[PDB]
Design a protein around this ligand. Structure first.
Ligand SMILES: CCCC[C@@H](CN[C@@H](CCCC)C(=O)N[C@@H](CCC(N)=O)C(=O)N[C@@H](CCCNC(N)=[NH2+])C(N)=O)NC(=O)[C@@H](NC(=O)[C@@H](NC(C)=O)[C@@H](C)O)[C@@H](C)CC
Lengths: 99, 99
């Protein structure tokens, strides 16, 4: 698609057999979701944004689908005001910013 | 330009007769800079990110140049780990996310 930016750029994703929404965020290194539980082992990871830092769970080699791209990536799980898809997954979609 | 997302998408901007760098952030409603002082009146504004909220100065009708685009927009000034250009200014550049 070609997404315009007068609205927040929200997409549907599929993760752990569940449908969620998330924000395509070029200013995010990583992907953070709050409203899913992921299975298996993880490691603590610290992330930082505009409010300060937050501790999250780093789940590796997670399968995820975004438009109809089936990619595998690190997904962080923890508190965030909005689910966000970061550059770690946007690279895999071949997404670009154009102007 | 077409900007790929394997790196942080950082651009040069010109604001208050000074050159700065900032991150093109589709997950930002607003534009936030920390390393410039702007002149004149402002209004308190709260912004929210990962980690929590922060109090900033809202400066209105600020002129700013991003890649030969001379736009006027709200600029927030306050603490942030990175200067960021939000959708308020990216819309004025006709910027889109494409995949
Ligand atoms: C969660 C809700 C939206 C996502 C968020 C992402 N912004 C970037 C800002 C870039 C840093 C200033 C961010 O946190 N990125 C993180 C996300 C977490 C992540 N792990 O990816 C980041 O890459 N963190 C890296 C660190 C970047 C370090 N960068 C640096 N030092 N320059 C990391 N590994 O933790 N947007 C925001 O934080 C924006 N907020 C908004 O847009 C909100 N609107 C208002 C009006 O406040 C809306 C959420 O209600 C900000 C900028 C104010 C307009």
């Amino acid at each position: 698609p070609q997404i315009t930016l007068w609205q927040r750029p929200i997409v549907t994703i599929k993760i752990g057999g569940q449908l969620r929404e998330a924000l395509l965020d070029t200013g995010a290194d990583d992907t953070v979701l709050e409203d899913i539980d992921l299975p298996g082992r993880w490691k603590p990871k610290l992330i930082v944004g505009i409010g300060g830092f937050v501790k999250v769970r780093q789940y590796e080699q997670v399968p995820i689908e975004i438009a109809g791209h089936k990619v595998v990536g690190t997904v962080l799980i923890g508190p965030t005001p909005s689910n966000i898809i970061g550059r770690n997954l946007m690279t895999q979609l071949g997404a670009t910013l154009n102007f």
